[PDB]
Amino acid sequence: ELHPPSYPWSHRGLLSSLDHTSIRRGFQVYKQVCSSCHSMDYVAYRHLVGVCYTEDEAKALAEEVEVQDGPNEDGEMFMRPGKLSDYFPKPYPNPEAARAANNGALPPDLSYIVRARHGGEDYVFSLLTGYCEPPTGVSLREGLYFNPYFPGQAIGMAPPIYNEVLEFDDGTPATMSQVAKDVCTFLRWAAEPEHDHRKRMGLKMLLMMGLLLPLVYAMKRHKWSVLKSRKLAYRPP
Template identity: 45%
Template sequence: MVRLIAALVGIVFCAALLWGAVLPRDATAPDQVKALHLHPREVDFTFNNPVVGTFDRQQLQRGMQVYKEVCSACHSLNRVAFRNLTDLGFNAAEVKALAKGYDVPSIDDKTGEVNTRKALPSDHFPPPFPNDTAARAANNNALPPDLSLITKAREDGSQYVHSLLAGYKDAPKGWTVPDGLYYNPYFRSLNIAMPPPLTEGQVTYADGTKASVEQMAEDVSAFLTWTAEPKLEARRRTGTGAVLFLIILTVLAYASYQRVWRDVKGKKTATPAV
């Protein structure tokens, strides 16, 4: 009796598997996020070439200006010190003047009270908010990320930052944007808490470059690439020199091999005397 019941259960199970295999499946609904999400646009940055690519100092200075006048209101740059800006082409006096435009936390030596002072070149860029709680409270509960390494933390790095900043659009028909969010097809979930940060002519460039949204997005993306990889040019020079050295060493080693073993090979191939 037990065997009969087990056999019936096995038959029913096999029949269910067979039915599930041959029964046509309902068409799955397409993933709307994947359908609307766009891959970052290609931008011809001067540092794109992995061998000889270098930073455009003028572009880096413009990008620093965009960060200072626009992005720094919400985003920190914790890993960059003011003295590092000399790599952008600023001299010591200019760096000192830039640092003085910021206040950093300090402690009064006489009273021990928490106070502020003007920043020094050795200081890092101060955060716009005292802590994460204050940052969320000021940004609809969204926490603005630190931008020091943002181009290393995001896939496609510089291209992604540029596309995101310049890619705000009206939501297509059928897509709902919740209150307090904005539609951006380059953001992973399409709805982003950051409002469009750039508008035409928002900054006035010292070199006279027209401050279009595309230009500002490209400039600040280049600047944030430098903050993430300040030694990029030195690393590439070192790598190129090392590769050239190895190529020359290989050629010399092969030539030495041929010279040293030439006579030995000749003796081995010579016809022995009878």
């Protein structure tokens, strides 16, 4: 195996947050590349509100995709434009169709992929950005490709990204690296949306605990002070 390298992510800091601007770019990646082949069951279009999209922008995207909802009074089920409460649409109806559509292989969900793989986002960027031909003596079966950052170095994940594989809205150059950076930032928000609010409490704590610990430590050595300073003697007859 290969231990991935650790990077200077913007959010590695104990108080550092996520580049919400980058989360905006990262969603555009999942939506135009991976949402056709990966599920993300545990997120909603509403969760994007106030983080990378606003209310109206996300609402517009809710109305782009059709969702199966509503037992008709006739007794049937139909399709409607999605809403914010709706979750990210699953590309496939069931995993067998996925194994059917990817040579027996299973595209995993990506709600918790950051926190479900050792190394975290460092792994993922190195994974996408680690494709290469196999070395000599190595040969793989059809469908499967080589990547050093996987156990056995054999996966069905064909190249999802490359230079100008897509386009961004903010005029960013869509280098393969720029893409893989933003998406991993998005996924770290998916698997840990509390991240940006986690640390603020982490900040409030250390300032309070910076105060209460010495103060309590004074009242202790205030009350115990009687005993640290007492004395004794022995006056027999």
